[PDB]
Each structure stands twice: as structure tokens, then as C-alpha cells.
Design an enzyme around this catalytic site. Structure first.
Site, mmCIF file in Angstrom:
data_model
loop_
_atom_site.group_PDB
_atom_site.id
_atom_site.type_symbol
_atom_site.label_atom_id
_atom_site.label_comp_id
_atom_site.label_asym_id
_atom_site.label_seq_id
_atom_site.Cartn_x
_atom_site.Cartn_y
_atom_site.Cartn_z
ATOM 1 N N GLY A 166 1.300 -0.862 0.203
ATOM 2 C CA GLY A 166 0.085 -0.012 -0.236
ATOM 3 C C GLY A 166 1.344 1.210 0.034
ATOM 4 N N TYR A 173 -9.898 0.229 -2.624
ATOM 5 C CA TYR A 173 -11.160 0.286 -1.531
ATOM 6 C C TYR A 173 -12.016 0.686 -2.013
ATOM 7 C CZ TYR A 173 -6.845 2.393 1.463
ATOM 8 O OH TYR A 173 -5.462 2.342 1.792
ATOM 9 N N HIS A 184 -4.866 11.405 9.521
ATOM 10 C CA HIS A 184 -4.173 10.577 9.875
ATOM 11 C C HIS A 184 -3.438 11.870 8.634
ATOM 12 C CE1 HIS A 184 -5.867 9.446 6.328
ATOM 13 N NE2 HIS A 184 -4.671 8.669 5.862
ATOM 14 N N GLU A 186 0.639 10.426 5.832
ATOM 15 C CA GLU A 186 0.642 8.818 5.289
ATOM 16 C C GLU A 186 1.986 8.677 6.488
ATOM 17 O OE1 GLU A 186 -1.162 7.873 2.463
ATOM 18 O OE2 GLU A 186 -2.114 9.649 3.243
ATOM 19 N N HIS A 272 -5.948 14.332 6.742
ATOM 20 C CA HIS A 272 -7.124 14.898 6.333
ATOM 21 C C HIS A 272 -7.706 13.156 7.041
ATOM 22 C CE1 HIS A 272 -3.738 12.296 4.138
ATOM 23 N NE2 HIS A 272 -4.576 10.839 3.759
ATOM 24 N N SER A 284 -5.764 4.043 -4.439
ATOM 25 C CA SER A 284 -4.066 4.945 -4.059
ATOM 26 C C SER A 284 -2.722 3.734 -3.676
ATOM 27 C CB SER A 284 -4.638 5.158 -2.402
ATOM 28 O OG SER A 284 -4.696 3.912 -1.461
HETATM 29 O O1 LIG Z 1 -10.078 5.227 2.522
HETATM 30 C C1 LIG Z 1 -9.656 6.241 1.923
HETATM 31 O O2 LIG Z 1 -10.334 6.214 0.899
HETATM 32 C C2 LIG Z 1 -8.551 6.907 2.043
HETATM 33 C C3 LIG Z 1 -7.988 8.489 1.693
HETATM 34 C C4 LIG Z 1 -7.248 8.343 2.106
HETATM 35 N N1 LIG Z 1 -6.562 8.298 3.079
HETATM 36 C C5 LIG Z 1 -6.247 6.434 3.856
HETATM 37 C C6 LIG Z 1 -7.756 6.038 3.491
HETATM 38 N N2 LIG Z 1 -8.045 4.804 3.774
HETATM 39 C C7 LIG Z 1 -7.653 4.648 5.531
HETATM 40 C C8 LIG Z 1 -8.207 3.246 6.328
HETATM 41 C C9 LIG Z 1 -7.710 2.064 5.867
HETATM 42 C C10 LIG Z 1 -8.208 0.585 6.113
HETATM 43 C C11 LIG Z 1 -9.501 1.011 6.122
HETATM 44 F F1 LIG Z 1 -10.224 0.181 7.315
HETATM 45 C C12 LIG Z 1 -10.060 2.366 6.433
HETATM 46 C C13 LIG Z 1 -9.043 3.573 6.252
HETATM 47 NI NI NI Z 2 -4.257 9.393 3.601
#
Ligand SMILES: O=C(O)c1ccncc1NCc1ccc(F)cc1
Ligand code: NI
Ligand SMILES: [Zn+2]
EC number: 1.14.11.66
Length: 347
Positions: A166, A173, A184, A186, A272, A284
Site C-alpha cells: 500500500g 478501497y 491521519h 501518510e 486528511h 491509492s
Molecule cells: O479510504 C480512503 O479513502 C483513504 C483515503 C486517504 N487516506 C486513507 C484512506 N483510508 C485509510 C483506511 C485504511 C483502512 C480502513 F479500514 C479505513 C481507512
Molecule cells: Ni491518507
């Protein structure tokens, strides 16, 4: 005044097919325009461009570890807990998502739906098909290919020999209404790129990297136990804070909705959070530029359970500072306003 300050508001860019072909350069370009100060930017690709022909042949795609998102709290402050549910296909997921129990409620303007997210996020726990290893880009695609962006991040795999799920590789997602990503930055305060392949939209909140310390102090204040235990607890991705709380405590933030076919870019130390509007699929990964390197050196990591060795970056791009740095005597102060050095050419 800094709250409204549009040098720090989220910008959107509409590159041409010529501007688009070179990823690293275009990132340098949007930074030459101040994009990085908001901590998030939107890039609309050219109308001709398409990462895939159609998304009709992915019903069978396996989501190995669907997570159910349990949220607890009140008064605009929440903690999100994950339960790994068992493996299921995109088709089973879509069915659950588009079902009558978990579908998007009725709304007129985006702001009505936002009220409904913040009123109902603790009820009726959704299922997010997150962190699925894969790419939906056809093999032929050479522009903005999340699977192969050609940044300086590539060093980790090339020199160090290391794969990080990742971060160096892409994730997918699968969203449904009210699925959430908590506050968070990154891993290693990297950049990220997010491409919404199809489906309903994704809404984002961003806090400018120059006010991120403010958000950290706020979270620390509200979760004193969590902060005593780990000095990067936001990195657990469990903490949800509503716009109303941010406004109330004077944290500058902006919002933007990402629609199918649009990229979002997050910048180093760009906090974000957000939520999906209904059934969707995003792809992503993380990436880097030369500016990232110092953020990488300074990144405050989780101290209670992802870590990238920066030596390979310092030796290559800061050879003159390596000894000093290894000694613990480097103390450059980050100026979050400054473009990456690659953007000198745009003046
Ligand atoms: O889910 C998104 O769109 C997203 C976008 C940006 N940064 C992190 C993001 N997800 C992180 C995350 C990872 C696992 C999860 F269960 C829930 C959220
Ligand atoms: Ni993120
Ligand atoms: Zn931790």
C-alpha cells in the site's frame, strides 16, 4: 483570515494531455502554484484519458479482509474500531452496499449529506473493503499509473530491496455509504495519490501542513490516555473529529468532494479524513519528491506497535549532510510553504 486564507485552500487543476504525461513534473508544477499549502489537491485528468475500458468484469474480485467500522463517541469526537469480517467478493459487497439497509440516504445539496454522516456515523455499522492489494489499471496505461509512478520513492525497492503493502504498491478501497477514513498523515509523512475509479463520490477534509501541530495538540487534549501511550496515535487511524469541533477550537481546514474519474493528491504532513457517499472503488499509493526527504527524517512514528530507512535517501540526495545527520546534529527547520526544488523551472 488564515482560516479563509486561500493560499491554503484546496486547489483543483485541469491539465492537458501534454501536461499530464509526466507525473513528477506536473506535481512540481502544482506545487509552484502553492497547491501544497492546503495539504490536498484535486487533479482532473483530460477527458480522453481512461485507466480501464470498463468495470463490468470485477464482480469476482476478492476482498480478502473486509472491515466493519464500529464508531463510538459523542459531541463531534469519535474512535473508530475495526472488525475484520470474512472474505467476500465485489459482487457480495456491491449487493450489501446498494441494499436497502446500507444505501445512501436522500439529500439535496452535499451539506445535507454531511449532517447525516456526523449525526449517524455511530449507528448502523458499514463495511469497507479496504487495503485490497491490486490495481484496476489496464497494463497499457502510461499516464499517472498508480502501480508505477517513477518517483524517488522507488529507491526503497531498488536499493533497499523492500516491498511495503500500500506504500510501494497499490491498494484498492471498496466503499459504501458512511465508510470513513480517520484523521491521519501518510506513513513517513509521504505524499499520496488517490484515483476514484467509479461509483459514488468521496468527501475529504484537509488541514494545512502549517497548522498540523494545532490538530495534534487538539487530539492530544481530547484523548490524553491515547497520547500518553503513543506519541503518534493519530497514525492508528482511529480518531474522527467533526468539522464543528475543528471550527470551535480554531483549526483551519477545507473540504472537497472527489467524483469518479478524479485524482486527489495529499502532501507531506497533510492531515486528511473523510467518508464515502455510497458504493465506490478507489485506488491509492504513496509517492515522494525531493522535498519529502526532510519530512521523512523528521516524521514522528508510532511508538507502540511502517518505518522506512532514510539512509538510502540521505546518502544519495544529501551526501554532504550524512555524517552530521547520523550524529543526531542535523536540525533543519521545515518550512511547509516552500515548493519542492524540482519546481524552479516554473517561474
Ligand atoms: O479510504 C480512503 O479513502 C483513504 C483515503 C486517504 N487516506 C486513507 C484512506 N483510508 C485509510 C483506511 C485504511 C483502512 C480502513 F479500514 C479505513 C481507512
Ligand atoms: Ni491518507
Ligand atoms: Zn502507536
Amino acid at each position: 483570515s488564515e482560516t479563509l486564507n486561500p493560499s491554503a485552500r484546496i486547489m483543483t487543476f485541469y491539465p492537458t494531455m501534454e501536461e499530464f504525461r509526466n507525473f513528477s513534473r506536473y506535481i512540481a508544477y502544482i506545487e509552484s502554484q502553492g497547491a501544497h499549502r492546503a495539504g490536498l489537491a484535486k487533479v482532473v485528468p483530460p477527458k480522453e484519458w481512461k485507466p480501464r475500458a470498463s468495470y463490468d468484469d470485477i464482480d469476482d474480485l476478492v476482498i480478502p479482509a473486509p472491515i466493519q467500522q464500529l464508531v463510538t463517541g459523542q459531541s463531534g469526537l469519535f474512535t473508530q474500531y475495526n472488525i475484520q469480517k470474512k472474505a467476500m467478493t465485489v459482487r457480495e459487497f456491491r449487493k450489501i452496499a446498494n441494499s436497502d439497509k446500507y444505501c445512501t440516504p436522500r439529500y439535496s445539496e452535499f451539506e445535507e449529506l454531511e449532517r447525516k454522516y456526523w449525526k449517524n456515523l455511530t449507528f448502523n455499522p458499514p463495511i469497507y473493503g479496504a487495503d485490497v492489494n491490486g490495481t484496476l489499471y489496464e497494463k497499457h496505461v502510461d499516464e499517472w499509473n498508480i502501480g508505477r509512478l517513477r518517483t524517488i520513492l522507488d529507491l526503497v525497492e531498488k536499493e533497499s530491496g523492500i516491498t511495503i503493502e500500500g506504500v510501494n504498491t497499490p491498494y484498492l478501497y471498496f466503499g459504501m455509504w458512511k465508510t470513513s477514513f480517520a484523521w491521519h498523515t501518510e506513513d513517513m509523512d509521504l505524499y499520496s495519490i488517490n484515483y476514484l475509479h467509479f461509483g459514488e463520490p468521496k468527501s475529504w477534509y484537509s488541514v494545512p501542513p502549517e497548522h498540523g501541530k494545532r490538530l495534534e495538540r487538539l487530539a492530544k487534549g481530547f484523548f490524553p490516555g491515547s497520547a500518553q501511550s503513543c506519541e503518534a496515535f493519530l497514525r492508528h487511524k482511529m480518531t474522527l473529529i467533526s468539522p464543528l469541533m475543528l471550527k470551535k477550537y480554531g483549526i483551519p481546514f477545507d473540504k472537497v468532494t472527489q467524483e469518479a474519474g478524479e485524482f486527489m493528491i495529499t502532501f507531506p504532513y497533510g492531515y486528511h479524513a473523510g467518508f464515502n457517499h455510497g458504493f465506490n472503488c478507489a485506488e491509492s499509493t504513496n509517492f515522494a519528491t525531493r522535498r519529502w526527504i526532510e519530512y521523512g527524517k523528521q516524521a514522528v512514528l508510532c511508538s507502540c506497535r511502517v518505518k522506512i530507512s532514510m539512509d538510502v535517501f540521505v546518502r544519495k540526495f544529501q551526501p554532504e549532510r550524512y555524517k552530521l545527520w547520523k550524529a543526531g546534529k542535523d536540525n533543519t527547520v521545515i518550512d511547509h510553504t516552500l515548493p519542492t526544488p524540482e519546481a524552479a523551472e516554473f517561474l
